[PDB]
């Protein structure tokens, strides 16, 4: 194995990267990307002070990256810490539940897409997807599911300020803003109906599912 | 009526009435053909599609509970019942054999 | 030993990462400002770890005004590719706000221009119906395959290049107006009809009409008219994106 | 998933707006209606007079049935949001 | 695995159709670097036991040789991260 | 009593009435297909299928009671129990057997 | 009551109005049945169907009042006061038939 | 809607070719076909029930149910043949 | 909608030519045209079947057999040979 | 007429003046060309090669020169775009494949 | 639209060639093909368009090498970037000509 002192280089090096790992290989992305498309929705673009939203994104990823956590530790954390397993093993063998979590939500497409794009050879089985092939395929996978999500989120602000605007131009009033009626009963809508239990809810099923 | 019921050219009030319709006209075809066979006089076909969790990714698999009335006397096969189970299961996207019972107008399973 | 020559893989590894978050910065979904900017830098950051090995590395040193005219090269493609995709979002946008200002919704722009009052929320509508159309279509997926592919066709050194070809792209302006009136032909002329009608109305007693009884009809049929037309845009959307793509095919060669 | 799902729910999105909007408009359709009609048989002929009970008609509307309504909207938000997990792609 | 061994087969039929990275330089280098500071504590070790043969000399220009080996280690992680913050600054 | 009884209602019906709707033409159907057997003159059947709640580590399954009135003197067969069960169980998404509970004319429990 | 009672349905319908007439219903059809017993004259139900929530040490779980008339000198059964039990329990989502009572016209509680 | 109404045109082409076979007097084909998935695991094999009513007497011969698995699995995209189910008038499974 | 009703049409007009066909009386043709996974192992492809009513003792060539199989696989994009099934009015597998 | 429409309509335009200029020829009496026109995927490399199938009625006993084979394979190939001349199937009015 | 003026083009363009064809002493009616390369949504690649002319002689009126050549010629030039070794000549028999 390493010496120490190359050991607790290696240690000090890797914890650099821990943003890198919070944003392309874990589940934050797709937990923002909606969180910023509802604020763009609701008409309000500061409302929750980000900070807010940020500490409730962090909250879910780790609620939602618990079991993925728990695997890491149990088969690589521990050894490692128990002098069983060499610096250089535990990282390899941690690698693994993150890998097929980066795979149970990576779409096909993608990986069609990058095992292509780096001329390699046949992928028969998922087992042959090497880290450089499914790492983009996640973070593409993981931008349009958010986007997707955030673009069917988006359709009921957007129906209430249609009828909003029909209703004040049946009258006449047609130098009414209709974004000014239109913010407050979008705000009551987003209370009326768990705006954030159901939100919650389906992000985290849309992780489980 | 099956497909007919849906043919009625009538607004389907939600995408849950679409199902209903759907659910209720698979079920009278497969009646249908049931009644067709020769020992069977008249069927009925009862399908309980199932329903997701909310964060289990455990799941589980639809149902389908088969009466049939048979001619005077006319007792079903062991290979009937074999049949009739295999239609039954292959209608129905996902459906584990299983998860098909198949009983006669007395109340005796002819499944198991 | 204990080379690691680096500026070997400097060169080799910039000028691709150059072309890739060009292309990053203005592509459409990949551009949108709601994806932190650290993500869009790791995506360009890992395409080209996966791709720029496979190319021949170049020599030409960073401290040069070939380097210079390498980037503008590179900015060049990047920002060419992603336009010509956004192209086919600015025709539905436009075929929906002109469907949308055909409804009466917003009629303070006849009277003042540019007035700071303007709610093209029809526009939005179908311009969010054909983001998730193009993400249905795996359409972001093919423009990063012909990112990478262009360089068959174009490679990373600085080679020499055309004009009318330009135009092309300028003149793909068009398009955005030309197609915007096939999907917005069939209902607009609808309610052309029934504005016609409303004239007929106007053609008997005099006022009485107009401003009163027509706006809220127009409205109401726009919405049930166009509503029915939903599902004729997503042909008309496969159309936009195999035009955009073909052309940007031709051209860019 | 499907494209045909994707023109499905928008398809039914604005039905629903259609719903939500049929009747306001209509309410001041007819009302303006009514007056028109009634100016023409009277001969008077004066733009601002229509306007005044058309806002008196549509706001009656909403305390008519504006709970209708509102039920209806934050069912179809509701529904959609639960179904969100499920047409991803 | 017998799956990993077909999938073994399936890349030596490829290479007969057909007829190392920055991160693998970086762990040779990190490999290198640690197999250098073992052998010249694994020296050491071995004089301060006694056994015959080992000179201090050989020890201290060895434990000299480790320790700049570990200093230029130290520096290439420095300027690699300093970098990298570089880059993850750019403008996207 | 009948699937096409509720399929009307106007429109205006908040989707609980869509619900409970399907709910009672799914008790009308079982309760027709029950009487159907032989031995059965009149079959009722009630359904309690549970609102999904988050409230609970795992979600909670449905229950079903049955009554059944005999023909004069036709008490129902053991197998003929257990027909009836399966069918009702089956036509009930998650309907565990043993949450159906079968009672005659005389509130004797045949379950 | 009951089914019937949700017929005409004024457009002006809030979800609680709607909850509170289907527990009317489901009281008035079980009620019904009970009186189908041979037994029972007329049969009254009251369903408490209250709030969930989550902290174990406050759960108040779905309660039923029962009252039933019987015929001169009918007497219920030990059994047939089971079979009312599973009866009212299973027509409540998640109803503990510990919490059915069952009394007569008398006052005597039949269950306990 | 759009997707129901292809299926249940499909299982009627269908059963009307099964028909044309000399043997058999009518037809009767049912199509489960599941719901796609486009990830990278998620994937289930549709599958369909055919019962045929044969004129009388006239036994469908083993190329004949042959014939019959073939054109039904063809017919569906990605039909595993082994998941056609064939059966007669009298619950005899040809398969 | 578009694409199925271009479906209809060309299992249509290749029934119609191999009617056209000396021997044969009447053609149905059934066209399976899917989407396919990539890595997934051995996948699938898109696939027909075809059944011919032949004229009264109008047994069909091998090499009828094999004009038929070319025309049906030209006229389906990417459609394996091996993947057309024809069939007799009998049940005989001709293929 | 939408753009798979207006495609459509070409496919079907240039089949018909295929047969149109089979028949004009001597021995044959009517043609018949089915085009398959491929399409391209962002999961495959090369495009699959369009296919053409070509049924022809001849004259009572007119059987066409191996020569006439080889002309009618040229003129289907080179009517659609990247047609490669060994996808092209020539079958005549009983059956017989002339390619 | 411009898919729709593409075809019209094309076919024109076919018209007038058969028609000058014809119009040559030996050639009786003529018919021409045109097949224009497309476009791809990726990757670069040319495809020489290419042009199959079928000719029907006046009874018996063979035509010359020289004639085979002025027909290559005229046809090449006529499609903008024509190969001439693209463009196929035939008879009313089938007889390759070119």
Known sequence: ???????????????????????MMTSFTRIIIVFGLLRNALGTPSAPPNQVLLGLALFLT????????????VDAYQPFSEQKISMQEALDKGAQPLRAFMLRQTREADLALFARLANSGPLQGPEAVPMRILLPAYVTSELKTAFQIGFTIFIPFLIIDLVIASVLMALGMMMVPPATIALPFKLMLFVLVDGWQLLMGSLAQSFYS | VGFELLDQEKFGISQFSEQVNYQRALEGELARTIETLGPVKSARVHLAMPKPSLFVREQKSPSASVTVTLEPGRALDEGQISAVVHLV??????LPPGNVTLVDQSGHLLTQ | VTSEQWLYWLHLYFWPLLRVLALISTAPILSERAIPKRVKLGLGIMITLVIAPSLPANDT???????????????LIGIALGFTMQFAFAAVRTAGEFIGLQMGLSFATFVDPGSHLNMPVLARIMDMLAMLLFLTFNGHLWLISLLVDTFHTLPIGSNPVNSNAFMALARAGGLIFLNGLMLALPVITLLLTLNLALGLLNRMAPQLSIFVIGFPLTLTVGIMLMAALMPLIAPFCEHLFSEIFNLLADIVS | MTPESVMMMGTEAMKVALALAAPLLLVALITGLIISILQAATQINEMTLSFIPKIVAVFIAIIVAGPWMLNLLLDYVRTLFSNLPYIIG | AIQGIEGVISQLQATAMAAVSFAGQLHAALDRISDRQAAARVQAEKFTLGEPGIALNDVMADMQKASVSMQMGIQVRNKLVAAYQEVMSMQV
């Open chain 2, 89 to 94: 299961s292959s209608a129905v996207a996902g």
């Open chain 1, 62 to 73: 780790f609620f939602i990256m618990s079991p993925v956590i728990d695997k890491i530790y």
């Open chain 3, 61 to 75: 040193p960073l401290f040069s005004i070939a380097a210079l005219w390498l980037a503008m090269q590179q900015i």
């Open chain 1, 1 to 23: 194995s390493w010496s120490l002192s190359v050991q607790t280089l290696v240690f000090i090096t890797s914890l650099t990267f821990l943003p890198a790992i919070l944003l």
